[PDB]
From TrEMBL:
<dbReference type="GO" id="GO:0005739">
    <property type="term" value="C:mitochondrion"/>
</dbReference>
<feature type="domain" description="Methionyl/Leucyl tRNA synthetase">
    <location>
        <begin position="6"/>
        <end position="371"/>
    </location>
</feature>
<keyword id="KW-0067">ATP-binding</keyword>
<dbReference type="GO" id="GO:0005524">
    <property type="term" value="F:ATP binding"/>
</dbReference>
<protein>
    <recommendedName>
        <fullName>methionine--tRNA ligase</fullName>
        <ecNumber>6.1.1.10</ecNumber>
    </recommendedName>
</protein>
<dbReference type="GO" id="GO:0005737">
    <property type="term" value="C:cytoplasm"/>
</dbReference>
<keyword id="KW-0436">Ligase</keyword>
<dbReference type="GO" id="GO:0097014">
    <property type="term" value="C:ciliary plasm"/>
</dbReference>
<keyword id="KW-0547">Nucleotide-binding</keyword>
<dbReference type="GO" id="GO:0004825">
    <property type="term" value="F:methionine-tRNA ligase activity"/>
</dbReference>
<keyword id="KW-0030">Aminoacyl-tRNA synthetase</keyword>
<dbReference type="GO" id="GO:0006431">
    <property type="term" value="P:methionyl-tRNA aminoacylation"/>
</dbReference>
<feature type="domain" description="Methionyl-tRNA synthetase anticodon-binding">
    <location>
        <begin position="383"/>
        <end position="522"/>
    </location>
</feature>
<comment type="similarity">
    <text>Belongs to the class-I aminoacyl-tRNA synthetase family.</text>
</comment>
<keyword id="KW-0648">Protein biosynthesis</keyword>
Length: 522
């Protein structure tokens, strides 16, 4: 099936201004999207805001502002933040959007009509801040901001008791089918240890899920249950549905939603190929969402990838401050290189300088300038290579192999491993150049310099191609410099070694340009 490659971020609670971590979550989505476009696929990257609910209403109340004006305000800050971050996101969805509301009601009725919703009670614990139901096994003693109280073991936020007559979803009726799913498709959750988590959790057992709430308790800031106005639809069913809505909106060039199609198939987007989420919101995506879709008879997503950060809680680092100080591409690169799947990373100013200088400036930067220098490349062109020594071939072989391995990494997706894979190959090219001493060759042996300079150029191109989803602005400056024609800057075709042919002319130089400039160690 050729289809639109559909990738998502989570949609974020608008309770507080956007910080790092939304930025991280959405950057991953952006990168995954960007890569598939570099492959020449159709993409649809979605992101947005989660605007309804108790959490969000009570933040609006605590600021003495109306929910309508509050959400709109904060949503605008999220849009400004993401514009400023220079993502290539295809659409920004809001759950207040009337077309979304329409899809939630539509979905609820599917779920209702299958007989997977019934009127019951939920008498148990709830984290308003997580908008999560919790069994007593996942609460414990702690402090309110300072009295003694019970808190979520998930997040350490304050939980409270809840005894409401609610509409209930038959999640228990879906235990075995989730379990078949998980096993049948072992790629479906990334990273592997969270897949194991999700299975152990569901093995142990699933109770039914309370998919409505008394309207009094939600401050009437939510979507009403179809055919029962005394209730509102659980904020997470509302939130998760953003993906299905997203998959059905027609969007103009300006980024404005213009139409909601009846059948998701019409746009060939649903289901999501990859859902980017933080580890704090796994259950909702890996248990609830599949159960809802299986009820509605909808297709399940292909991949849920849950990165190592929290999606929401501010537990100092301002992206825009750091982006101005170090660079937008540098910051994105640093965040992506440093953060693994279980997050044990160093985000100190010292480390950011070490990597910017070490990797981007010394390994990539230097190398780009060597092969384009007037000193070495005296014709500002791609020379035609002579015969290859077994060293020459050793590196060519690395450069040939890099797209295959970088691709697989991107498809996991483990963007960090992908970056390493490339930079390994960059460090090889430096090593190569150190040996050959191209500076010495331009006098000694011009015939050899051709072979050397050609391989350098083509490695630096192919590495920069595979780096392009991470360093989107700089890859354009690298290609401009190497004089790579615009057609050769994307497509699986141009992952092949030698796509840009000899006798191509390098880009014009500038009197004081440097690609990445070192920052003092202080
Ligand atoms: C359907 S994703 C919803 C995520 C939630 N709004 C959060 O910020 O964590």
């Amino acid at each position: 099936v050729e289809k639109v490659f559909f990738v998502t971020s989570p949609i974020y609670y608008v309770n507080a201004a956007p910080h790092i971590g939304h930025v991280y979550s959405t950057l991953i989505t952006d990168v995954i999207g960007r890569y598939h476009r570099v492959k020449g696929e159709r993409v649809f990257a979605l992101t947005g805001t989660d605007e309804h609910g108790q959490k969000v209403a009570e933040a609006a109340k605590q600021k003495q502002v109306s929910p309508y004006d509050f959400t709109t305000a904060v949503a605008g800050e999220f849009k400004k933040c993401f514009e400023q971050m220079d993502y290539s996101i295809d659409y920004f969805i809001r759950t207040t959007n009337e077309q979304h509301k329409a899809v939630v009601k539509e979905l609820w009725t599917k779920l209702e009509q299958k007989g997977d919703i019934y009127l019951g009670r939920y008498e148990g614990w709830y984290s308003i801040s997580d908008e999560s139901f919790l069994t007593p096994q996942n609460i414990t003693d702690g402090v309110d901001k300072g009295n003694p109280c019970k808190v979520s073991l998930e997040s350490g936020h304050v939980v409270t008791w809840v005894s409401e007559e609610n509409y209930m979803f038959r999640l228990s009726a879906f235990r075995e089918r989730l379990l078949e799913w998980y096993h049948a498709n072992p790629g479906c959750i990334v990273p592997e240890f969270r897949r194991r988590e999700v299975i152990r959790a569901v093995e142990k057992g699933l109770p039914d899920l309370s998919v409505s709430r008394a309207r009094a308790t939600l401050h009437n800031w939510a979507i009403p249950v179809p055919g029962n106005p005394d209730h509102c639809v659980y904020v997470w069913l509302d939130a998760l549905t953003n993906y299905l809505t997203g998959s059905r909106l027609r969007v103009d060039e300006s980024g404005k939603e213009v139409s909601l199609v009846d059948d998701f198939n019409e746009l060939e987007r649903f289901p999501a190929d990859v859902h980017v989420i933080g580890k704090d919101i796994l259950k909702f995506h890996a248990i609830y969402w599949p159960a809802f879709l299986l009820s509605a008879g909808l297709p399940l997503p292909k991949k849920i990838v849950a990165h190592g950060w929290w999606t929401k809680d501010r537990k100092v680092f301002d992206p825009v401050e750091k982006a101005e100080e170090f660079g937008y591409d540098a910051l994105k690169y640093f965040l992506l290189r440093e953060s693994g799947f279980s997050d044990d990373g160093d985000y100190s100013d010292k480390n950011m300088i070490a990597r910017l200088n070490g990797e981007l400036a010394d390994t990539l930067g230097n190398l780009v300038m060597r092969c384009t220098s007037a000193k070495i490349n005296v014709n500002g062109e791609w020379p035609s290579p002579a015969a290859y020594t077994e060293e020459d071939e050793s590196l060519i072989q690395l450069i040939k192999d890099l797209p295959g391995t970088a691709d697989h990494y991107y498809l996991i997706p483990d963007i960090q491993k992908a970056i390493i894979a490339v930079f390994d190959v960059l460090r090889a090219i430096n090593a190569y150049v150190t040996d050959m001493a191209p500076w010495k060759l331009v006098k000694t042996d011009p015939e050899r310099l051709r072979t050397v300079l050609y391989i350098t150029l083509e490695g630096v191109r192919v590495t920069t191609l595979l780096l392009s989803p991470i360093l989107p602005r700089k890859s354009v400056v690298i290609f401009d410099m190497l004089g790579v024609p615009e057609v050769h800057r994307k497509g699986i075709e141009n992952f092949e070694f030698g796509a840009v042919p000899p006798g191509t002319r390098l880009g014009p130089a500038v009197e004081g340009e440097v690609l990445f400039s070192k920052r003092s160690t202080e």
